[PDB]
Design a protein around this ligand. Structure first.
Ligand SMILES: *[C@@H]1O[C@H](CO)[C@@H](O[C@@H]2O[C@H](CO)[C@@H](O[C@@H]3O[C@H](CO[C@H]4O[C@H](CO)[C@@H](O)[C@H](O)[C@@H]4O)[C@@H](O)[C@H](O)[C@@H]3O)[C@H](O)[C@H]2NC(C)=O)[C@H](O)[C@H]1NC(C)=O
Ligand SMILES: *[C@@H]1O[C@H](CO)[C@@H](O[C@@H]2O[C@H](CO)[C@@H](O[C@@H]3O[C@H](CO[C@H]4O[C@H](CO)[C@@H](O)[C@H](O)[C@@H]4O)[C@@H](O)[C@H](O)[C@@H]3O)[C@H](O)[C@H]2NC(C)=O)[C@H](O)[C@H]1NC(C)=O
Ligand SMILES: *[C@@H]1O[C@H](CO)[C@@H](O[C@@H]2O[C@H](CO)[C@@H](O[C@@H]3O[C@H](CO)[C@@H](O)[C@H](O)[C@@H]3O)[C@H](O)[C@H]2NC(C)=O)[C@H](O)[C@H]1NC(C)=O
Ligand SMILES: *[C@@H]1O[C@H](CO)[C@@H](O[C@@H]2O[C@H](CO)[C@@H](O[C@@H]3O[C@H](CO)[C@@H](O)[C@H](O)[C@@H]3O)[C@H](O)[C@H]2NC(C)=O)[C@H](O)[C@H]1NC(C)=O
Ligand SMILES: *[C@@H]1O[C@H](CO)[C@@H](O[C@@H]2O[C@H](CO)[C@@H](O[C@@H]3O[C@H](CO)[C@@H](O)[C@H](O)[C@@H]3O)[C@H](O)[C@H]2NC(C)=O)[C@H](O)[C@H]1NC(C)=O
Ligand SMILES: *[C@@H]1O[C@H](CO)[C@@H](O[C@@H]2O[C@H](CO)[C@@H](O[C@@H]3O[C@H](CO)[C@@H](O)[C@H](O)[C@@H]3O)[C@H](O)[C@H]2NC(C)=O)[C@H](O)[C@H]1NC(C)=O
Ligand SMILES: *[C@@H]1O[C@H](CO)[C@@H](O[C@@H]2O[C@H](CO)[C@@H](O)[C@H](O)[C@H]2NC(C)=O)[C@H](O)[C@H]1NC(C)=O
Ligand SMILES: *[C@@H]1O[C@H](CO)[C@@H](O[C@@H]2O[C@H](CO)[C@@H](O)[C@H](O)[C@H]2NC(C)=O)[C@H](O)[C@H]1NC(C)=O
Ligand SMILES: *[C@@H]1O[C@H](CO)[C@@H](O[C@@H]2O[C@H](CO)[C@@H](O)[C@H](O)[C@H]2NC(C)=O)[C@H](O)[C@H]1NC(C)=O
Ligand SMILES: *[C@@H]1O[C@H](CO)[C@@H](O[C@@H]2O[C@H](CO)[C@@H](O)[C@H](O)[C@H]2NC(C)=O)[C@H](O)[C@H]1NC(C)=O
Ligand SMILES: *[C@@H]1O[C@H](CO)[C@@H](O[C@@H]2O[C@H](CO)[C@@H](O)[C@H](O)[C@H]2NC(C)=O)[C@H](O)[C@H]1NC(C)=O
Ligand SMILES: *[C@@H]1O[C@H](CO)[C@@H](O[C@@H]2O[C@H](CO)[C@@H](O)[C@H](O)[C@H]2NC(C)=O)[C@H](O)[C@H]1NC(C)=O
Ligand SMILES: *[C@@H]1O[C@H](CO)[C@@H](O[C@@H]2O[C@H](CO)[C@@H](O)[C@H](O)[C@H]2NC(C)=O)[C@H](O)[C@H]1NC(C)=O
Ligand SMILES: *[C@@H]1O[C@H](CO)[C@@H](O[C@@H]2O[C@H](CO)[C@@H](O)[C@H](O)[C@H]2NC(C)=O)[C@H](O)[C@H]1NC(C)=O
Ligand SMILES: *[C@@H]1O[C@H](CO)[C@@H](O)[C@H](O)[C@H]1NC(C)=O
Ligand SMILES: *[C@@H]1O[C@H](CO)[C@@H](O)[C@H](O)[C@H]1NC(C)=O
Ligand SMILES: *[C@@H]1O[C@H](CO)[C@@H](O)[C@H](O)[C@H]1NC(C)=O
Lengths: 763, 763
């Protein structure tokens, strides 16, 4: 509630339905908590700052607070944060509290009984006692990880007294990652659901370690006795490179377990007895181990019928280069398997019969096989994997056939990189491979491919319309980081159903001058929608115009359009005129010092998104914008403009997203925003503007403005801008960083003063 | 003769034995020829400048000139250079003349009969007539190439009248490269020795084309009907991709031919009848052709018993990936073959039996096989090639086994890149290959290897002293652009005879902090002489000191020595102290803002070459140089020093090569060079110095100075430096760019004035 604040430098978000008020003071360099904080707020953000300590009077009048965040307030900085006694007892409605990165020595006392979450990561608490945990009898989620490890050493092994967590009957999630823990803290409460003991120094597991945990769902034991070969981070192998000793009858009481992580445990064998009782396991991680021989046997896979995810990445043997992948026949028992990763299983040749166990997996979607240094791989063997969604053929050497400060979620699963080409259907990610030329015979029996990534292959070829013949249903093609010779306009002609084409980073042949550059090759593409050819350094073009009846988006950044539009050369003025359906242009970083007269007349009639960022436009004309009757998102950021148009209404009748970020403008015209009621977005940040007059900023236009930025510039706070001073502190226009970034240059003592906090009584 | 010049801005070189005087005015921006040119000069250099034309009075008093160079005086610039009539008749002793890059339309007339060389490259002369060549009856070398091609088009085919060169009885070398020539200009004089007709549009060769040439030694026919696939430069294939039609009885009259180039001719067959008469052929070029099938036959090789060089690079077929290299059995007839290049013959697997024809070549030294995309290659097959000097295993994908403005020489042969490792003996250049780990078994039967290049392989391995076991006689090892984990001090221990080690560009594992970095691994290397570990970004080291009893040169540039020598950290102060025999150090680009006191005491006793370039030394102490009793070549270029030492004699008693290039020094001490008789080299260029006093620059010290630089700085030419003005124009000290780079800041009209050309009579 309370809607209107007075001088708070933190953003306020109101949710009437949720009855939640959010205050975000992230990255504000506040030495002390600012005054005037509303009593109706629910979430308080007090992240990285210069707060010396915490006082009971800080939250004296705040009784509705339900979330306090104090993450990374002192990253190892002055002395450690000190908390006065009874500093949290007054928050009866408190439910969540974060104290990560505060260099605390012991668990704070006096916490309210209503607390449900407590985070104490990146601290110096290496001792756990029941006396300090007595007050936390109603806690549900506990985060005590990253207290003693290589980044934040403490030189003392973690000590937990007997039955420390036993009386925490409400505990559900416990994390002890990177805490130098040697022994699992028995006895954990029976209500635990997620346990995170990974990246510790645990060497053995007892048979009664998880005897009472029946509701556990997620168990993590990574980093115990890890595989330290070629590790880019400090780690200590266990002795004799022994594996993490886990008894056969260890996961017996676990019946609701769903996620089990054993990554980087130096395991050599996986007994089937482990998975005898856990019949509902969904995700299993076994990466960074020594299970190369176990993959050939994989006898334990017969006890996982409901498995969804299986990770076996980077299990290669030392000084061993396998001739082929030895997949066990027990892989056919993974009926519900969806994602499979066999990376780091480096081998020479991949054959069709080696993937036979995966032929009957109906629910399999993703097959990851990248980073395996595969030399010989017949692509026609994938004709049986039509139901697969993503097939990974990454940096391995396949060649053509011959003749705590952020992330409030804390413990979260690894989110897979959702590439832009996955949404189009079947994907064959052949990026960074050893393919140096394209044959139509190689891609035979692959008409089902809706996607094909070939970035980084460094292919030097002159396509004439026959290489991608079998790819009849291809919709997305990636050809970045290659050497494409556009000597013919018939390239990609046989890709009838292609929609998006990426030929970026092909600067090699485009840099050479005097050779033909057929830029009209998009005419044959009937259903092409997006074309990305940026960072190509295109300086000449044999074709006068580019023709396309369906292209809508075109990226032409990082090229040389100045030479194409050189003074006295009108050949390429109407280069984009024939693109009738084009709606977005991205001609940026083209070293365009100036725009010759006539280019705007040659722009497509349906242009709607024009960008000229980072170009260096010394003088950009504005009366020529009348030609563009559909322009809405003109962008001139990071340019060297110096003059605003006399009347924006006379320039464009539809511009609504004008941007002039990081420009050099010292003053605005007296009628800059006169009768411009169609404008919605305006940006003038990072400029050299001095003052704004009333006649240039009418309130009628400013009322409908969604967002306006005037931060990080050189406004002068003198008596000549009383109207501006009154308006900035009495309007509802959303101006970000109003009290943090925009300051006053002068005069004299007014350096660094906040405009919204200015009250010139003498004026 | 004449020894002493007056105001010439060109360097003068005297050779009394050769009676030659050389004047070099290269890159001087001279609008007109300067006055005071000696009459005794022999060679005149008048390269790229702003000379408008040539007048007869330019060489009026010069009668001893024997060489005039006028190369690239106007690169397509004002209008073309105009030569007045009878502008060269007065040079009776002229023998050589260069007029390249002058946009001349016709051959200049009135040349003296004593001329022997004439260069007219990069001009607009596309018509040749006997009338203009009548005056050149005594010429020997003619250069008329690059007159009409893609860089300098003329849109007209070259026209040569019948028997134009017939009467040039003294002609020996003729070049017509890139001249758009269609037909060979019959009839060439019988005294021709070198003919250069390459990069032309010749489509056919007549049987009488070379009927009279019996003394010809070098013949070039490249670029005629060229192979235009993947060409980074403009080219036009002949029609029907027809080959250059050469009759069988074409090289019949040629008996002294030694070099024949047929590179890029789209040839398909090489008849043996071509080489029936040329029994003394030494170098043969057949690259960029379609002789992939001909290599399997190679019937013509039986007629080349005296061949020395054979080039067959880049003859791969389009859309064909050969399974193996098909070398003909006729290769055994090349008894005298020394260098063989089979690059661009892309094939999958290389076997031992495929190199059988080369097993009996006693004189074979270099075997080039790079850029072939070889996948499988057993390195043990090279045990039979012990006599070979260089074996090329370049960017192909071999993996470990599984289970006119310059170049006055004009027409010159392609100089092979002499790598630094070739001088050590047998070389196995395995750079940029697909090797990702090293096994001792792979390098078996290779104990004869004196060199091994492994740069760019990106090998991630933790060597412990057993990988390079069979390489007992290895002396040079290259490991640049890799990922070396120095977790053990026993690395390279088994390389007993190693002398030079290069572990540069291994920044990956060295960037990580907290992992061990055993920098004392050089102790085991008993005979190590040079160690290059630059660009490694080394910021921490587990070993306190580096020990080596034989290391003499150490490159440690592009690292982080500031953190190692951080204030309050004296652990790594004596890092290089134990290097007893070290004589050269290259610690540069280390971001060293300042040198903590004590590092000089920890320097090796026998240090002689110290470099601190591009470091950013805000304040470098000088009294600590007394510790180094053997310093001679101290370098502080591209630094931010501001104060010179009070007395250089008191600092170092052996410094003789002090360098302060691109520094920021405004003034020198009044006793900077007092009693410093041991100094030989001094550099103060690109500084902010204002004036020099007499007491700081005694003549006794300056007499023995070999070289001194005071160019491109901010000297002020007022009346306060009369002594300096007198001394700079009356001393014999070699001061480069004395009248071209060093100018006067002021005062007033004295901007840009030459100090050596200053005469202040009013002073
Ligand atoms: C202001 O502070 C409030 C608390 O003081 C915040 O309310 C919290 O909001 C989160 C959601 O953002 C709730 O989390 C719930 O989690 C359960 C369990 O889901 C678990 O599993 C999923 C994966 O399937 C995982 O993503 C979750 O993180 C959990 O691990 C869900 O079923 C719920 O729908 C909900 O997501 C908290 O319970 C809730 N706390 C309280 C006390 O209600 C509020 O978000 C804060 N607002 C801002 C703007 O920061
Ligand atoms: C000043 O101008 C003088 C002429 O006006 C220059 O004298 C010339 O010097 C060059 C050497 O630099 C002489 O070239 C001769 O070439 C023959 C034939 O060798 C040929 O083959 C070799 C490869 O085996 C090749 O490298 C050569 O370039 C030749 O193509 C050699 O046998 C000789 O030893 C010598 O190298 C000229 O003959 C000579 N000209 C005259 C008229 O004597 C002088 O070099 C100029 N000085 C400077 C500093 O520029
Ligand atoms: C995780 O806990 C283990 C518990 O052992 C820590 O190992 C201990 O580390 C300290 C500090 O390096 C060792 O103290 C050392 O003692 C030697 C004398 O033996 C002394 O010369 C050193 O200066 C240092 O004080 C201690 O011995 C060692 N414990 C054992 C059993 O070896 C480990 O450091 C902890 N990890 C982190 C990141 O804090
Ligand atoms: C085809 O495959 C290539 C390589 O696998 C993909 O390129 C990679 O795309 C990812 C995601 O866009 C890039 O990650 C990003 O890197 C930047 C730094 O450049 C970082 O700031 C981002 O946060 C993100 O991590 C990755 O760099 C890029 N790799 C290269 C070599 O460009 C490409 O996206 C694939 N194409 C399709 C259509 O899936
Ligand atoms: C090397 O010599 C050949 C000799 O044929 C040159 O080919 C000629 O090039 C000119 C200029 O492009 C052509 O003139 C053209 O004529 C057409 C009408 O046919 C006109 O529309 C053009 O505007 C141009 O004026 C000429 O036809 C052509 N000759 C032949 C037989 O095709 C070639 O250009 C020369 N190469 C260089 C680098 O100068
Ligand atoms: C081992 O093989 C590698 C690659 O074949 C050699 O590196 C290459 O060395 C040459 C000659 O030093 C470099 O050429 C130079 O390039 C610079 C530009 O960086 C240019 O300014 C010079 O004029 C010269 O052309 C080449 O760049 C370099 N390649 C790489 C990737 O570094 C290496 O020298 C070999 N080692 C031994 C001991 O022979
Ligand atoms: C694939 O892996 C399986 C299981 O490790 C291998 O089968 C074993 O092979 C060894 C060596 O011959 C025998 O001693 C075992 O008795 C075999 N066990 C079983 C259950 O068959 C198999 O040889 C591997 N195949 C390949 C090609 O490496
Ligand atoms: C990859 O596999 C496919 C199919 O298994 C092979 O296609 C065969 O090609 C030959 C010659 O073109 C035909 O005679 C066969 O009938 C094809 N097989 C089928 C099932 O139709 C292809 O040759 C394989 N690739 C390589 C390099 O061997
Ligand atoms: C596209 O390029 C391919 C590759 O060169 C052409 O295929 C060749 O065509 C020529 C002329 O008909 C034949 O002599 C070759 O035998 C063909 N090679 C192969 C491997 O088939 C193809 O004709 C070109 N297409 C167009 C329209 O230019
Ligand atoms: C793209 O433009 C080029 C010209 O820049 C077109 O090439 C011309 O094609 C016609 C028709 O065959 C020929 O008569 C011309 O001689 C060609 N000119 C050149 C310079 O090659 C090409 O056809 C265009 N492609 C498309 C698909 O429109
Ligand atoms: C290596 O090259 C030789 C010469 O081109 C090949 O020998 C020819 O092979 C063809 C095809 O079988 C025959 O028609 C010719 O009669 C052969 N000529 C001779 C002189 O033998 C040979 O087959 C090639 N070998 C490989 C493995 O490609
Ligand atoms: C590369 O060639 C060498 C020699 O030709 C092979 O060395 C053989 O290795 C086997 C098993 O180690 C021995 O039984 C043979 O006696 C060796 N040959 C000789 C001549 O001694 C080596 O195996 C080959 N590499 C590969 C990958 O096959
Ligand atoms: C250097 O590293 C190699 C590779 O690990 C070591 O060779 C292994 O040594 C262990 C211990 O003796 C054996 O169990 C392995 O069988 C060996 N592997 C191979 C491929 O031989 C070697 O011992 C190490 N040497 C030193 C001095 O540490
Ligand atoms: C290089 O220096 C390291 C120390 O930085 C040496 O490692 C020590 O070796 C001794 C002898 O075995 C051990 O007692 C120490 O515990 C080792 N210290 C560490 C930190 O590992 C290493 O031996 C040195 N190598 C050489 C060749 O001198
Ligand atoms: C123009 O581009 C911006 C870029 O963020 C986008 O937000 C906007 O929706 C685009 N406008 C149209 C009409 O597509
Ligand atoms: C020191 O290095 C320079 C670098 O050019 C070299 O010329 C000089 O000979 C070296 N001095 C000694 C004594 O090796
Ligand atoms: C400087 O040199 C003079 C003359 O040799 C000597 O007397 C004096 O002690 C020296 N001072 C230092 C600090 O070296």
């Amino acid at each position: 509630a309370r809607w209107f604040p007075k001088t708070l430098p933190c953003d306020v978000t109101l949710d009437v339905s949720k009855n939640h008020v959010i205050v975000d003071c992230t990255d504000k360099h506040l030495t002390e908590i600012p005054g005037g904080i509303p009593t109706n707020t629910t979430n308080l953000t007090l992240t990285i700052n210069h707060i010396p300590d915490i006082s009971p009077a800080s939250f004296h009048r705040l009784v509705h607070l339900v979330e306090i965040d104090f993450r990374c307030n002192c990253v190892p900085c002055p002395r450690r944060l000190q908390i006065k006694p009874r500093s949290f007892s007054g928050l009866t409605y408190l439910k969540s509290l974060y104290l990560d990165g505060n260099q605390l020595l012991e668990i704070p006392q006096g916490l309210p009984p209503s607390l449900q979450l407590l985070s104490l990561e990146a601290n110096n608490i290496f001792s756990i006692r029941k006396e300090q945990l007595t007050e936390l009898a109603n806690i549900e989620i506990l985060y005590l990880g990253q207290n003693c490890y290589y980044r934040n050493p403490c030189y003392v092994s973690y000590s937990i007294e007997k039955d420390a967590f036993l009386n925490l009957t409400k505990l559900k999630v416990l994390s002890l990652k990177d805490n130098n823990v040697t022994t699992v803290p028995t006895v954990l409460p029976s209500t635990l659901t997620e346990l995170y003991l990974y990246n510790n120094m645990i060497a053995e597991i007892q048979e009664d370690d998880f005897n009472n945990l029946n509701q556990l769902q997620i168990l993590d034991l990574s980093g115990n006795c890890p595989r330290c070969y070629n590790a880019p981070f400090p780690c200590t192998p266990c002795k004799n490179n022994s594996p993490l000793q886990i008894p056969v009858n260890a996961f017996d009481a676990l019946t609701e377990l769903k996620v089990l992580r054993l990554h980087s445990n130096s395991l050599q064998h996986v007994p089937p007895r482990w998975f005898k009782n856990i019949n509902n396991l969904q995700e299993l991680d076994l990466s960074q181990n020594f299970l190369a021989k176990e993959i050939g046997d994989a006898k334990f896979l017969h006890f996982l019928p409901n498995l969804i995810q299986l990770d076996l990445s980077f299990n290669f043997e030392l000084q061993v280069y396998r001739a082929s992948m030895n997949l066990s026949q027990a892989f056919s028992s993974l009926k519900s398997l969806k994602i499979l990763r066999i990376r780091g299983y480096v081998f020479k040749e991949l054959k069709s019969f080696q993937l036979s166990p995966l032929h009957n997996l109906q629910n399999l979607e993703v097959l990851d096989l990248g980073t395996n240094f595969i030399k010989i791989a017949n692509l026609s063997m994938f004709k049986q994997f039509k139901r697969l969604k993503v097939i990974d053929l990454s940096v391995n050497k396949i060649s053509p056939s011959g003749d705590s400060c952020r992330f409030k979620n804390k413990e979260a699963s690894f989110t897979s990189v959702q590439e832009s080409c996955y949404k189009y259907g079947q994907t064959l990610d052949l990026s960074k491979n050893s393919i140096f030329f394209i044959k139509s015979s190689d891609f035979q029996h692959l008409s089902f491919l809706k996607c094909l990534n070939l970035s980084g292959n460094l292919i030097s070829q002159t396509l004439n319309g026959s290489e991608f013949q079998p790819l009849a249903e291809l919709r997305y093609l990636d050809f970045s980081n290659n050497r494409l010779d556009l000597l013919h306009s018939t390239a990609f002609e046989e890709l009838r159903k292609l929609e998006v084409l990426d030929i970026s980073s092909n600067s090699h042949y485009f840099q050479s001058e005097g050779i033909t550059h057929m830029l009209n090759f998009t005419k044959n593409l009937k259903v092409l929608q997006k074309l990305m050819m940026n960072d190509n350094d295109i300086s000449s073009s044999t074709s006068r115009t580019m023709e396309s009846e369906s292209l809508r988006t075109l990226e032409f950044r990082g090229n040389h359009l100045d030479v194409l539009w050189r003074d006295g050369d009108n050949r390429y003025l109407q280069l984009f005129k024939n693109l009738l359906k084009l709606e977005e242009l991205d001609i940026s970083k083209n070293s365009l010092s100036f725009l010759p007269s006539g280019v705007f007349d040659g722009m497509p009639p349906n242009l709607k998104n024009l960008s000229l960022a980072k170009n260096g436009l010394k003088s950009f004309i504005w009366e020529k914008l009348r030609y563009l009757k559909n322009l809405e998102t003109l962008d001139l950021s990071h340019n060297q403009l110096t003059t605003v148009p006399e009347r924006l209404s006379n320039c464009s009748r539809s511009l609504k997203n004008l941007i002039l970020k990081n420009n050099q403008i010292r003053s605005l015209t007296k009628y800059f925003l006169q009768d411009a009621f169609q404008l919605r977005y305006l940006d003038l940040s990072s400029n050299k503007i001095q003052m704004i007059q009333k006649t240039s900023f009418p309130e009628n236009v400013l009322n409908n403005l969604k967002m306006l930025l005037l931060h990080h510039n050189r406004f002068l706070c003198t008596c000549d801008a009383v109207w501006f001073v009154w308006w900035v502190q009495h309007t509802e226009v959303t101006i970000p960083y109003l009290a943090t970034d925009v300051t006053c240059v002068g005069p004299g003592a007014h350096k660094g003063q906040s405009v919204i906090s200015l009250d010139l009584y003498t004026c």
